[PDB]
Symmetry: D2
Subunit: 171 residues, 4 copies
Amino acid sequence: MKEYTLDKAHTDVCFKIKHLQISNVKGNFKDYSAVIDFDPASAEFKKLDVTIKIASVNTENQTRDNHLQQDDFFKAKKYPDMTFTMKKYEKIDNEKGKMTGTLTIAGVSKDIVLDAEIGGVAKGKDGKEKIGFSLNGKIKRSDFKFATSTSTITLSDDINLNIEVEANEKE
Amino acid sequence: MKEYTLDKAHTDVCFKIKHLQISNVKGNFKDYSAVIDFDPASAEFKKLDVTIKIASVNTENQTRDNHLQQDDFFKAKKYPDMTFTMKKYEKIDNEKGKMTGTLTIAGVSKDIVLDAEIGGVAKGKDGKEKIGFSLNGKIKRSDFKFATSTSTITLSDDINLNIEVEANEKE
Amino acid sequence: MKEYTLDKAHTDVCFKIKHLQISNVKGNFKDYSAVIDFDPASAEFKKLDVTIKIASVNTENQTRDNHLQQDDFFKAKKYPDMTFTMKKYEKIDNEKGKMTGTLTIAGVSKDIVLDAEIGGVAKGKDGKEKIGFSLNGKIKRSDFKFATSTSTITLSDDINLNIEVEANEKE
Amino acid sequence: MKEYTLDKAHTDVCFKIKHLQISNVKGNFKDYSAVIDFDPASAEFKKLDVTIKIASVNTENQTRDNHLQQDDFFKAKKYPDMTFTMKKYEKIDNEKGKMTGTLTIAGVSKDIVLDAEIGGVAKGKDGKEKIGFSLNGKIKRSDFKFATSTSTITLSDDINLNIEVEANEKE
Ligand SMILES: O=C(O)c1cc(S)ccc1[N+](=O)[O-]
Ligand SMILES: O=C(O)c1cc(S)ccc1[N+](=O)[O-]
Ligand SMILES: O=C(O)c1cc(S)ccc1[N+](=O)[O-]
Ligand SMILES: O=C(O)c1cc(S)ccc1[N+](=O)[O-]
């Protein structure tokens, strides 16, 4: 034989190991519209109707947003908007309520409960009405047979929703 | 009631969904030593003995490197170095061979096979010998009862090793 | 050379592949006690206080139940019971309500909301009062720094609770 | 109010929690054929050619076997058999060797190395030749763009192969 000494400069004692990391996908939507009927005297919602253009999804990452619109997700060609229709607002107190409504995603419809938390009624300095408020709730992808190709392992069956709203009087 | 129009500027139609992402952890070690005996006439390794200071792990992320040394991983206090001892080199041809040796990690020892691929023998311009070569192989964390607290789900049971070596003659 | 024909009887063309399966752990508790104060005239809970002996966990699998009591879970030696204390019952209607209370698990306490669904008030055939009802709600393991060693990947951060109750008048 | 005592007989203090379990899928194939040329004087394989009918997969579970043949896996209609063609057998010693060959799965072909371990040459009691032997090796699903729809998380990128063979002389 013959003996050698490492050249530490061009020698790697090296390893790869595969691990998982769980992480949240957060996204809003740039383009959506709503009808909001709300009686500040009794702090009750009367009519809440939301249409969201799927096209305008924003999960801060373009190559995913595009992918969201494909058959294995939204089908934005066939089903271009998702919609929410309030069917009932059960008041808890002036700050809180239980809003039941119809969610439709890719033409499939389920009744869901959202937690209304009134961020605060006011009559803005200009003399016209404003309100803050938020709607919170969990929906199951499985309930809307959504992204059915994707396993409940890779991506959560649970979607959490937070609709933050400022909103001003009409005409 | 009363009617409101969204203020799109301070309104988020928002969602969070939890998903997993598989990813490789790659790390070398800054401080290690080796005894390398190799006969270029027959391209056979004769003795290969490596000691790696666990302390010097580098997975390009300090807060993980530190964590690697704790009880649930390396135990670098109790077991400060991991070691490899060649017990056999079965030659395939001048470029390839099957190196069997003893790996010890945190005082637990298993015989492992590495795939020797000679990157190339030479007599460097200065008239002294050099060799390139690499050792490749998979080891199982479970085989060395390693990081036993961490599930084989979160972090792979499989560790892949690639030892890249340049090495020059002695004295 | 020489030619051979397989003996299909003692020949396996064989493969192993590792895959994940998500699955629910369902468990009750054999031993627990409660104080239940409820006014059938207004269908409001007045006081709801539950103590559950951790010891009596039953996830239909003994070797897991035992393991539940160890440091990396319940610590049943140090913290032998988990407890729920009602702090507020906000009535929705006669069938539904929002119960807020203090949950304590291994000595850590958080206020949680449960969804009360009255399964039905009655005056049983014997002339004494009975009530059915259920409490539903999600709690986060992370909120109670629970099983902190176990990753939110292996085991869900979310625990779902369903307390089904039949209950009869006192004395 | 009024006070109630639980009826422990019809009361569940109950919980669901979602967890993952990693597990091996093991399967053979019922129907396959091979050409085996092997020189017991030098214990070298000369020609090894295997064709496996995908149709005959057996992972001890019919509803999965069927599913294996669909577009998101084998495409057994379009690509009814997978095949292995030996291109080289590098002998280690009389018990061991490194077999390089072409694997084709759903019409995609990669060269793979299998570890030949001769279970034992003999001349059986009837005066004719027999041999035992096994071929072991890992292949990557990704290398054969296989089940590409299924994430490397749900199902391992790594497939392990063990071909166990008894085999008798021809004519
Ligand atoms: O990608 C690489 O070349 C590689 C790098 C390191 S540090 C360890 C193992 C490897 N493997 O397994 O190939
Ligand atoms: O972290 C938040 O405040 C949040 C943000 C968005 S965009 C959606 C849901 C949320 N939830 O569930 O809270
Ligand atoms: O456990 C076994 O012996 C084994 C069995 C089969 S069918 C395939 C691969 C294997 N490996 O990888 O060892
Ligand atoms: O499936 C059920 O009815 C259920 C059962 C138990 S023991 C706990 C929670 C549950 N949830 O969340 O519904």
